[PDB]
Amino acid sequence: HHLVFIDDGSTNIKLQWQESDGTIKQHISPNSFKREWAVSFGDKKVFNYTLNGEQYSFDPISPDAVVTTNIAWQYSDVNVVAVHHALLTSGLPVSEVDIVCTLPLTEYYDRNNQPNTENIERKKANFRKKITLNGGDTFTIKDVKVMPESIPAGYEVLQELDERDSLLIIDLGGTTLDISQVMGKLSGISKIYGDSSLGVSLVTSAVKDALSSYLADDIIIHRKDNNYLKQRINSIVTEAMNEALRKLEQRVLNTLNEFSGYTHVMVIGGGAELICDAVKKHTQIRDERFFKTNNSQYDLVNGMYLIGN
Amino acid sequence: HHLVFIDDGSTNIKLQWQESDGTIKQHISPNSFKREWAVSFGDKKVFNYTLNGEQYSFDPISPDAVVTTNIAWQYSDVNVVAVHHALLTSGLPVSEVDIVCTLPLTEYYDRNNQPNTENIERKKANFRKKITLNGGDTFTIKDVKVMPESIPAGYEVLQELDERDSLLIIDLGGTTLDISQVMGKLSGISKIYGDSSLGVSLVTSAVKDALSSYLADDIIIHRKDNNYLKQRINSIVTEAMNEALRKLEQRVLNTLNEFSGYTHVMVIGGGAELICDAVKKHTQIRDERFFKTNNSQYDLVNGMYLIGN
Numbered sequence: 032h033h034l035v036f037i038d039d040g041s042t043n044i045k046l047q048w049q050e051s052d053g054t055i056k057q058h059i060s061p062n063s064f065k066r067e068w069a070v071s072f073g074d075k076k077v078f079n080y081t082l083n084g085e086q087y088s089f090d091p092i093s094p095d096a097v098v099t100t101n102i103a104w105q106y107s108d109v110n111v112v113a114v115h116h117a118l119l120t121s122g123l124p125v126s127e128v129d130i131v132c133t134l135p136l137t138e139y140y141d142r143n144n145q146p147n148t149e150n151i152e153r154k155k156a157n158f159r160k161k162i163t164l165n166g167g168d169t170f171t172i173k174d175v176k177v178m179p180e181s182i183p184a185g186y187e188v189l190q191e192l193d194e195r196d197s198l199l200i201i202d203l204g205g206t207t208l209d210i211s212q213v214m215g216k217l218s219g220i221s222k223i224y225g226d227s228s229l230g231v232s233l234v235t236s237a238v239k240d241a242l243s244s245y246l247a248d249d250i251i252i253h254r255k256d257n258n259y260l261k262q263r264i265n266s267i268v269t270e271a272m273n274e275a276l277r278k279l280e281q282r283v284l285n286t287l288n289e290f291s292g293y294t295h296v297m298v299i300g301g302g303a304e305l306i307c308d309a310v311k312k313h314t315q316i317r318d319e320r321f322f323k324t325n326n327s328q329y330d331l332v333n334g335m336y337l338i339g340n
Numbered sequence: 341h342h343l344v345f346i347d348d349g350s351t352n353i354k355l356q357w358q359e360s361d362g363t364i365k366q367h368i369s370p371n372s373f374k375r376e377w378a379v380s381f382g383d384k385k386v387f388n389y390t391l392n393g394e395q396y397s398f399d400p401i402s403p404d405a406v407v408t409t410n411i412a413w414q415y416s417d418v419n420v421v422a423v424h425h426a427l428l429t430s431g432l433p434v435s436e437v438d439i440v441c442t443l444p445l446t447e448y449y450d451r452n453n454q455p456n457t458e459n460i461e462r463k464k465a466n467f468r469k470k471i472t473l474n475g476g477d478t479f480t481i482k483d484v485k486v487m488p489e490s491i492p493a494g495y496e497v498l499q500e501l502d503e504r505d506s507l508l509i510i511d512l513g514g515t516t517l518d519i520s521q522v523m524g525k526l527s528g529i530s531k532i533y534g535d536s537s538l539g540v541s542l543v544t545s546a547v548k549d550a551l552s553s554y555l556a557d558d559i560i561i562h563r564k565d566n567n568y569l570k571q572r573i574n575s576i577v578t579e580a581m582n583e584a585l586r587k588l589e590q591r592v593l594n595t596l597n598e599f600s601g602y603t604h605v606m607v608i609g610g611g612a613e614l615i616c617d618a619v620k621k622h623t624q625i626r627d628e629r630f631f632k633t634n635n636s637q638y639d640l641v642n643g644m645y646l647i648g649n
């Protein structure tokens with residue numbers, strides 16, 4: 032079977048898997064689905080699913096998309112649809128697959144930092160829900176393993192740490208800021224933290240107000256090039272973005288005040304690039320001990336792959 | 341002992357209690373504390389606390405206030421400080437008190453909608469942490485009981501419902517939208533929902549951007565009076581607020597699509613007035629079965645009082 036590692040996040044589903052020839056592929060797919068089939072009169076291609084006697088369709092523009100920011104989204108029908116759609120648009124041949132998926136830190140672990148067995152099993156069972164697609168066959172999910180978010184992204188680093196050092200893993204997602212503090216060699220977890228009131232979406236929504244999702248996203252990724260901005264549009268948007276970024280940074284730095292005793296720091300998630308500078312400065316962590324990739328939104332799923340593949 | 345009912349929310353702490361003479365009092369106190377004593381050279385009055393060998397002070401203006409939007413805030417040192425400060429500014433005489441406090445729906449209950457016993461006990465034990473105040477004595481918390489959020493606010497109504505009807509309780513807080521669907525006579529809970537990516541703060545922050553916290557709060561509460569706006573300031577702020585409100589409404593209505601089979605609807609929390617209209621319209625719930633007070637931010641703590649007092 033193909034083995035697919037899946038970071039099913041509330042913004043995008045990230046996939047990683049190894050091809051027959053040993054080539055490693057990554058994939059990303061939005062999770063925007065409405066609880067209704069999409070109608071095409073001939074122009075658009077549509078992905079119309081049925082899950083539990085309910086219609087779903089991929090829809091990246093309707094405002095009536097199903098919410099994905101609630102806690103129980105991890106165990107929802109629409110999550111299952113989102114994962115099947117990701118598989119279906121990945122380029123993998125339709126087939127039986129084993130998967131490894133994630134639960135957010137505060138779902139994977141209980142408030143005593145021990146694995147939450149009931150949540151883990153609920154996550155596995157969710158993918159037994161049966162799905163159909165109009166005008167095509169669907170992947171068949173077989174074995175399901177569950178990992179926590181965060182930890183796998185830091186594991187390659189954790190292997191190099193003294194059992195006594197501890198890595199601070201800072202994950203700024205689209206809708207959440209989650210942080211773990213983990214003992215070297217993954218000998219234990221000293222602290223877990225989850226705050227769903229801040230994510231990249233703060234900045235995206237701010238920019239959007241000053242003014243699709245793409246325009247704002249493009250404006251943000253190209254904030255360092257003045258000609259792109261002037262070109263892409265027709266000074267206000269700019270100030271708004273900088274204030275959003277400023278407020279984002281302020282709150283992230285506030286959050287870090289909840290942690291101490293860490294010797295190493297790593298920043299992951301799609302928002303890593305937006306707070307990287309402010310986090311390095313504030314932590315005063317000597318650079319050899321500060322970790323950030325150039326593909327931050329895939330750090331988790333890559334770490335999962337290196338562990339479980 | 342005085343018995344104090346406490347809704348310790350991430351924005352404000354709400355208190356309710358009965359006086360010796362049977363008079364019912366309510367109180368509200370912000371939860372903004374920095375992990376450091378506040379310095380007064382003679383002008384300001386300061387509340388400087390020590391919790392676990394750590395300094396805290398009430399601070400409604402410094403940006404470095406301790407975060408209160410993370411999940412574990414319910415079990416934090418700073419929560420304990422916030423509750424003692426609320427008591428201390430309530431007008432109650434300093435003394436030994438029994439209290440009833442709340443856990444959010446998704447902390448009080450596990451993902452199988454059964455009471456989470458470990459979380460409940462962790463909440464009780466939190467108030468055993470010892471606290472001191474500079475230049476004054478602190479209340480002594482004795483017995484602690486814990487109720488869930490939401491349910492108590494709807495209980496007076498639930499008593500009147502057929503065991504077969506079900507009340508949809510919609511709680512828009514400062515940082516969270518939580519919803520329960522409860523069988524009449526509190527015979528059971530059919531569904532629990534928690535989304536921490538939306539709250540009144542969306543609107544408050546939007547207004548603030550268009551431009552203290554008060555100015556934005558005042559602008560919002562008086563959005564229906566054009567002279568107040570013109571007077572309070574020096575058209576932009578207006579459009580921004582209306583777009584924030586519009587987006588708020590859109591997402592709340594999206595959330596309601598996750599629920600069905602309810603015969604009654606109730607809207608509570610500080611944000612109830614901001615979505616009341618859109619919720620009544622969208623639900624198409626006949627008015628005798630739609631419940632909203634004129635003191636929405638105290639609905640929970642009042643319901644707790646009526647139950648436990």
Ligand SMILES: Nc1ncnc2c1ncn2[C@@H]1O[C@H](COP(=O)(O)OP(=O)(O)NP(=O)(O)O)[C@@H](O)[C@H]1O
Binds near residue numbers: 040042205300
């Ligand atoms: N280099 C970058 N600069 C700016 N934004 C980025 C960058 N890379 C990714 N993003 C965006 O950051 C957002 C968050 O990405 P991501 O962390 O993968 O979301 P998520 O995992 O699905 N959300 P969550 O459930 O809260 O953890 C997305 O909208 C990305 O497009």
Ligand SMILES: Nc1ncnc2c1ncn2[C@@H]1O[C@H](COP(=O)(O)OP(=O)(O)NP(=O)(O)O)[C@@H](O)[C@H]1O
Binds near residue numbers: 350561611
């Ligand atoms: N009638 C009103 N109109 C507009 N805003 C209001 C009104 N009443 C209260 N608010 C505000 O709404 C916000 C949310 O209040 P509240 O629901 O009590 O917060 P909370 O319980 O502490 N937050 P949370 O932990 O997310 O549940 C506060 O900032 C209030 O000031």
Ligand SMILES: [Mg+2]
Binds near residue numbers: 041204205
């Ligand atoms: Mg993520």
Ligand SMILES: [Mg+2]
Binds near residue numbers: 349350513609
């Ligand atoms: Mg509340």
